[PDB]
C-alpha cells in the first residue's frame, strides 16, 4: 500500500532534544512531524499516496496536435497531411514531463478523427462514409509527395486504416529511445564543434506520421482534422525539476521571456 | 448475450497486428515440406556475409567494375591516404548498397561491431604494408598517418594469407545507432595509408588493386522495420 | 490469469486480467505499484542526520 | 566535531573547519561502468589519482549587487591537468564529481549563496528565435554570470535570477544536490554528484553533465571599514574518470 | 481552491526579543522560509494546472 | 520584488520598540500567493484535494 | 550540549541555544492533588493542554537605570486563554508553573539579572498606616517596577532594591527558587514552580502564590553604536491546572 | 470468479460474476444485501420496553 | 596563522616535484601537490611534501 504515516502521542517534554532546531545550510531538509512540537494524539490514518505516483500522474491521455487535410484542398491543406512527432508542442502535456529530465515509458497512441462538410458550388451530396489512413514513416524512410503514391504502399511502415463511426483506434509503441531513456532536457549542441542545434531538440528523431483520405475525392469537399493524444504507460522518471514558471515559446527551444515569481500581495501582513 | 464493451481500435486494421482469421479453404491439405538447401531465419545470416564495397564509387566508376577496386602502386614517396569515406553502414555511399547496408535500410536503429576485410589483388612478388585505421568521432577525420595511428588499427603485412581484417568495434554512446546520418549518432571514420610502399620486381606490374568486403559481427541487431527508400514506382507494374 | 485486488477502501474486491498480447508495451498500465524512496532527495546527507540531536555539533 | 572535515582525491587534499555536512547527490556515490550497463566495446583507460584530484577554479568576487555565477562542466575542466587532455584525445569518457566551494568571511559579514548541481541546465535565450552560443553558455574556467533584472541580446544567454536562467522558479532549485553557504554557520559546501545521464557514456565537449550555480539570496552586507573583497572559490575534483574511444585530439 | 468551508488558518511571525547586534555589524537582517509537506501528507483528484496556457500550438 | 531576489527575503531589524508583526499570510499551501509557486504548491495545483501536516523552516 | 533545550506544552514550544541549565524549585515537580491530600469533594476539572501551554506577557525594556520589574502569579494571567477562563468560573484553583525568561543580547553587551520566584512575596508600603492597594502590586499582563531610590505615597508600594519590597536583603533572594542571566553566558532562565501554598487549593483572584521578580544587580551597559533596545520577555505555561467549584463568572 | 445465486421464488439458479477492473467503484452495484435494523428507529429507548407488560408501571 | 581570532583566511599550500620549473599561477600550483589550508580553531596545517624521487638519495 501508499498508506501514510500515523501520527504519534506525545506528552509534555523538557529536555536537551532539539527537534525543531535544525542547520538548513546541509542539503538535508527536516523530518519534524507534529509529535515534536506539540502535545498530539494518536490518529490512525489510512490516506494513500495512490494517485500521485508518477505512473497515475502521467497515465492520462493528452492531445499533443491536430492536423488538417481536405479532399478538395479548400484552404491549402492538401490531400495529406504530416507531423513530425514531438510532445512540445502543447503546454499541458510536456509541462508534466518536464518535471522529470528523464523518462522511459511506453505510449499508448488513440486518434480522434472527424470530418465536416466545406462550402462549395457542389449541388447534391451523398458522400459514402470516410476511410482514412495513418501512416507512420520511421526515421529514412521514404514520404509521401502526393496522395497516390507508392509510399502508401505500406509494406514494413506501420498503419492503421479506420472507418469514420466507430470507436477512436489505437496501438501501443514501446520505448524505443537510443539511449536507456528519452532525455526531456539536453544541455549538448549536435556538434563536437559545440555549433549548430542546442538543447533537446539535437536528439528529437521520432519519424513523422501521414494521414489521408483512402477514398477518392467526391464533388463538393470534406476536410478531415485528426487529433493525436498520447498516454504514457509503465513509467519509470529520473531526476525531478521544477515545474515551469514561464510560458513557453518555442517548441523546439526553451528560450523564455522572463516572468513574475509569484502574484501579487499588498503588504507583508495579509489575512 | 453475454455483457461485453467494446473499447478503443475495435475495428481498426493495423498492418503489424497478428490476429487469427477464419480460412477460405478450410481443410485444404497442403504440399509435404522437403529440406531445401539454404533455410534463411534471421536476416543477420545474410548481414554477416561479405559483401564487396565500392569504395572507388567515382562518377566514371558507378557502372563498370572500376567501384569495387582502388588502385595501389609503387610510389616514389612514402604515399599518402589511399582511400578514407565517414563509417555509418547505412547513410554512406560506399556501405549502404553492400548486403549489410540494404539489410540496414530495411530498419531505422541498428548496434554492433562491423569487420572490414581487404584482400590485395597484386602479384605474388608484390609486397606491402598498409595502415588500416578507424577513428572514433569527435575530432573528425586524421589527415595524417600520425593522426590515424593514434586511433585503432590493424597494420596489414601482405604475405601468403591474402587478407586482413580491421575489425571495427562498436564504441558509441548509446547503444543503438540511427541507420540514417544523424550528427548525434556519428559513427567515426574509416582510412587506409602507406605504411611502407608497393616493392615489386621489374618484371612484375607497378600497380595493383585492392578490394574491401564488410559484413556484421556477432554481436550485431538492428531495429525498427521500415520501408527502404531505395525502390519506387509511379504507377502500378503490368 | 492473474488475480490481483482492487483498490477499495477506509474502514469482490479482486479483479481478473489476462494479457492478449504478445508485447508487455500492449499491457494495461501499471497503477497500483506505491513504491517509494523520498530520502534521495530529502535527505541526500553523507552523515546521517539524527532528528533530536544538533545539525552541527 | 562535525564542523571540521578533509577530503583527500589523489595528491590533493581540502581541509575545512566549519562545513554543514556533505551531500551526495541522489544517494548514489562515483564510480567505474559495470559490465553489464557497458555498450563500449573497447577497454576502458582509468587514469586514477592523475586525472581524480581537486582542480582550482577561478575565483569569483562576491558584490552587494551579485546575482549569481555558473559554470558548466564537464568543459571548466577541458585545460585542467590530464582531465583535460583526456579529454582531447577520447570521444567518451564518464566521471562523477566532489564540488567543494569556499567562501569564509568574518563574524561581522552576513550574506547567503545557494549552491546547486543541476543536471541538464538548458538555458534559454533573449532573442526566441535563436539559441544561445558557446560563448555564452561558458566562460570555462572563468564564470558567467546572472544578472538581478532582464537582459537583451540575440544569442545572449536569458540571465535573470527569478527564472534561474531556465524559466523555472529560482528558488524550486532545491530539489537538485545543493547545499546553503551562510556566513553565520558555515564557510564551505560540500556536493557529491555522481554520473548522471541516460546514457552510459557521452562526449565531454558535446555535453554537459550538469551545471553549477551559486546564487545569492541574502546579500552580501557589512559595515564600512571591514573586509571589502570576499572570493568565492571553487575546488572541484573528478572521480571515477573513464575514458573509451582513443584516437587523435580535437573535437570538431 | 480557495474555499471558505475548507478554510485552512493563518500564518504568522512577531517580534519575541528584538535583533541585538554590535556597533560594527549591520543592523538589518534577512530571514527566509522554506516549505515542504509532512509524511503524513496526501492529495487526491488529478486534474489540469492553471498556470500553463496557450493561444496556438508551438513551432 | 516580483521578478527580483527580493521576493524571496524579508528584512528584520534592531527596533527601537518590541517590534510588531513581521509578515502574516493566509494559510492554503495551493491557493495563497505565497505558497502556490513552490514545489510544494505547484505538485498541489495538479490535484484538488491535500491533507496532512506541512512544515516551514526559517533561517 | 547542555545549553540547548525544548520544552513543549500543550501546542506551545520553546527553544533555546543558550540556557543555564533548568532549576526545579525545592526539586519538587508540578502534579495533580492527590487523594489523601484533598478536601474539595467534587470532581475537579482538569483542562489539561488547553490551560498548559505557554502564554507570553508584555515585555520589559532593560535601560541601564532600570531597578527592575515583578508580577505577580496567577493575577497575570487572568486574562490569559482558557486559563483565565478557568478562574473567572471557579472557586478553587491549583497550578503549577514553568516560567521562561528570554533576553538575548549581543557580546559586546554586558549586564546580570537574577531572576526568583519568591513565595508569598507579600510587599510593605510607602505610609506606614496603610496597606498597598491593587493597582500597586499588580499591573496583570504588564509588569510594576522597582525603583532605585525610595518612594512616597499613600497606598503606593515601598519600592527600592535593597529591601527588595519586603523589608529583607536584596541579596538573600537566592534561598528562593532562581536563576541569572548573565548577559556573556546565557540567554534565558528556567524556573519549575510547583504548587506551593499551606492549604491544598486556594482561590485564585484572592491570593497570589508567587511573585517573579527580575532585578539587575549589574547594570546593562554597552558602547554608543550599538543596540539600545533590549526587551526582557517573560513566557510562562502552567502545568497540572485543576480547579473545583463551578459556578458563575466574576471575583467580588 | 464468483458465483452466487439469482433472486429466484416462492415455492441454474447460480450466475457467475468477474470483476474486470483495477477499482471498486467500477463494480456493479449491491442489490443483494437485505440486513436490516429497524430498532434504532422503532424502539429507539434506554429501558427495554416489553410488549405484554404496561408501557408506564 | 597568528591573526586575530576574527581574521581568518585559506590558502593553497603546494609542493611541485621538479622537470617543470616553479608555478607561476595558483594554477600550475595546484597541478602539484598541495593541501588546501582552512583557518579555524586549529591553528595550523601541515603540508606534508612526499619524497618523489628518481634515486633512493639526493645529495644535501
Ligand atoms: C487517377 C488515375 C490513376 O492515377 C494514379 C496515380 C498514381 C499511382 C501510383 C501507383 S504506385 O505508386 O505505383 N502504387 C500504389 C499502390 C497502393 C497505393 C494506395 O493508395 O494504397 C498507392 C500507390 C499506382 C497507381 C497510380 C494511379
Ligand atoms: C481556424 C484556425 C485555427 O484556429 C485556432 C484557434 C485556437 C487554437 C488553439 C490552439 S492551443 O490552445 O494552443 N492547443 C489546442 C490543442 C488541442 C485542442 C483540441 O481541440 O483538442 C485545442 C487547442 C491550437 C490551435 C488553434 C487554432
Known amino acids: 500500500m501508499g498508506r501514510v504515516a500515523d501520527t504519534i502521542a506525545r506528552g509534555p517534554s523538557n529536555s536537551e532534544q532539539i527537534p525543531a532546531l535544525t542547520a538548513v545550510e546541509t542539503g538535508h531538509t527536516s523530518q519534524v512531524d507534529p509529535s515534536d512540537t506539540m502535545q498530539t494524539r494518536h490518529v490512525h490514518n489510512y490516506h494513500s499516496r495512490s494517485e500521485s505516483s508518477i505512473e497515475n500522474f502521467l497515465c492520462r491521455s493528452a492531445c499533443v496536435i491536430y492536423i488538417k487535410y481536405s479532399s478538395a484542398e479548400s484552404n491549402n491543406l492538401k490531400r495529406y497531411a504530416e507531423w513530425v512527432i514531438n510532445t512540445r508542442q502543447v503546454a499541458q502535456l510536456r509541462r508534466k514531463m518536464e518535471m522529470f529530465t528523464y523518462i522511459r515509458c511506453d505510449m499508448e497512441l488513440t486518434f480522434v478523427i472527424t470530418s465536416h462538410q466545406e462550402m462549395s458550388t457542389a449541388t447534391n451530396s451523398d458522400v459514402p462514409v470516410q476511410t482514412h489512413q495513418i501512416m507512420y514513416v520511421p526515421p529514412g524512410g521514404p514520404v509521401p509527395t502526393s496522395v497516390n503514391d507508392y509510399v502508401w504502399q505500406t509494406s514494413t511502415n506501420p498503419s492503421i486504416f479506420w472507418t469514420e463511426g466507430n470507436a477512436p483506434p489505437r496501438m501501443s509503441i514501446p520505448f524505443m529511445s537510443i539511449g536507456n531513456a528519452y532525455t526531456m532536457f539536453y544541455d549538448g549542441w549536435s556538434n563536437f564543434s559545440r555549433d549548430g542545434i542546442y538543447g533537446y531538440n539535437s536528439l528529437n528523431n521520432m519519424g513523422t506520421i501521414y494521414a489521408r483520405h483512402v477514398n477518392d475525392s467526391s464533388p463538393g469537399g470534406l476536410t478531415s482534422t485528426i487529433r493525436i493524444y498520447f498516454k504514457p504507460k509503465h513509467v519509470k522518471a529520473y531526476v525531478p525539476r521544477p515545474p515551469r514558471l514561464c510560458q513557453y515559446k518555442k517548441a523546439k527551444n526553451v528560450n523564455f521571456d522572463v516572468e513574475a515569481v509569484t502574484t501579487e500581495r499588498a503588504s507583508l501582513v495579509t489575512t | 448475450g453475454l455483457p461485453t464493451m467494446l473499447t478503443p481500435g475495435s475495428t481498426q486494421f493495423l498492418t503489424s497486428d497478428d490476429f487469427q482469421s477464419p480460412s477460405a479453404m478450410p481443410q485444404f491439405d497442403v504440399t509435404p515440406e522437403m529440406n531445401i538447401p539454404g533455410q534463411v531465419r534471421n536476416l543477420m545470416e545474410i548481414a554477416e556475409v561479405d559483401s564487396v564495397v565500392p569504395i572507388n564509387n567515382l562518377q566514371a566508376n558507378l557502372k563498370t567494375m572500376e567501384a569495387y577496386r582502388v588502385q595501389v602502386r609503387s610510389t616514389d614517396e612514402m604515399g599518402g591516404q589511399i582511400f578514407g569515406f565517414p563509417l555509418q553502414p547505412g547513410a554512406s555511399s560506399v556501405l549502404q548498397r553492400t548486403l549489410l547496408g540494404e539489410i540496414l535500410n530495411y530498419y531505422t536503429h541498428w548496434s554492433g561491431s562491423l569487420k572490414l576485410t581487404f584482400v590485395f589483388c597484386g602479384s605474388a612478388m608484390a609486397t606491402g604494408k598498409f595502415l588500416l585505421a578507424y577513428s572514433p568521432p569527435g575530432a573528425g577525420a586524421p589527415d595524417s598517418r600520425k593522426n590515424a595511428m593514434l586511433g585503432t588499427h590493424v597494420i596489414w603485412d601482405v604475405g601468403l594469407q591474402s587478407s586482413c581484417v580491421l575489425c571495427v568495434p562498436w564504441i558509441s554512446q548509446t547503444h543503438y545507432r540511427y541507420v540514417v546520418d544523424d550528427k548525434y549518432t556519428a559513427s567515426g571514420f574509416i582510412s587506409c595509408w602507406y605504411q611502407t610502399n608497393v616493392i615489386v620486381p621489374a618484371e612484375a606490374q607497378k600497380s595493383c588493386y585492392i578490394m574491401c568486403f564488410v559484413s556484421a559481427c556477432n554481436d550485431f541487431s538492428v531495429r525498427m522495420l521500415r520501408d527502404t527508400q531505395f525502390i519506387k514506382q509511379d504507377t502500378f507494374y503490368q | 490469469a492473474q488475480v490481483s485486488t482492487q483498490k477499495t477502501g477506509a474502514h469482490i474486491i479482486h479483479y481478473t486480467n489476462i494479457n492478449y498480447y504478445k508485447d508487455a508495451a500492449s499491457n494495461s498500465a501499471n497503477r497500483q505499484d506505491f513504491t517509494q524512496d523520498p530520502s534521495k532527495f530529502t535527505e541526500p546527507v553523507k552523515d546521517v542526520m539524527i532528528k533530536s540531536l544538533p545539525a552541527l555539533n | ?252
Open chain 4, 1 to 252: 566535531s562535525d564542523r571540521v572535515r578533509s577530503i583527500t582525491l589523489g595528491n590533493s587534499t581540502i581541509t575545512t573547519q566549519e562545513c554543514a555536512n556533505v551531500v551526495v547527490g541522489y544517494g548514489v556515490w562515483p564510480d567505474y561502468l559495470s559490465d553489464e550497463e557497458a555498450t563500449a566495446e573497447d577497454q576502458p583507460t582509468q587514469p586514477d589519482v592523475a586525472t581524480c584530484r581537486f582542480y582550482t577554479l577561478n575565483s569569483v568576487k562576491w558584490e552587494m549587487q551579485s546575482a549569481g555565477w555558473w559554470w558548466k562542466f564537464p568543459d571548466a575542466l577541458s585545460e585542467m591537468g590530464l582531465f583535460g587532455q583526456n579529454m582531447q584525445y577520447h570521444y567518451l569518457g564518464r566521471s562523477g564529481y566532489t564540488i567543494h566551494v569556499q567562501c569564509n568571511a568574518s563574524k561581522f559579514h552576513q550574506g547567503c549563496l545557494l549552491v546547486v548541481c543541476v543536471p541538464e541546465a538548458e538555458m534559454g535565450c533573449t532573442n526566441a528565435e535563436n539559441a544561445p552560443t558557446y560563448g555564452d553558455l561558458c566562460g570555462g574556467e572563468t564564470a558567467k554570470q546572472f544578472e538581478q533584472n532582464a537582459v537583451t541580446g540575440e544569442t545572449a544567454v536569458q540571465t535573470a535570477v527569478c527564472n534561474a536562467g531556465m524559466g523555472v522558479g529560482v528558488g524550486n532549485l532545491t530539489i537538485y544536490p545543493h547545499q546553503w553557504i551562510n556566513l553565520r554557520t558555515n564557510n564551505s559546501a560540500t556536493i557529491v554528484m555522481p554520473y548522471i545521464n541516460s546514457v552510459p557514456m557521452d562526449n565531454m565537449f558535446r555535453h554537459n553533465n550538469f551545471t553549477l550555480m551559486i546564487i545569492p539570496f541574502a546579500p552580501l552586507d557589512y559595515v564600512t571599514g571591514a573586509s571589502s573583497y570576499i572570493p568565492i572559490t571553487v575546488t572541484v575534483a573528478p572521480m571515477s574518470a573513464e575514458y573509451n574511444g582513443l584516437r587523435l585530439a580535437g573535437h570538431q
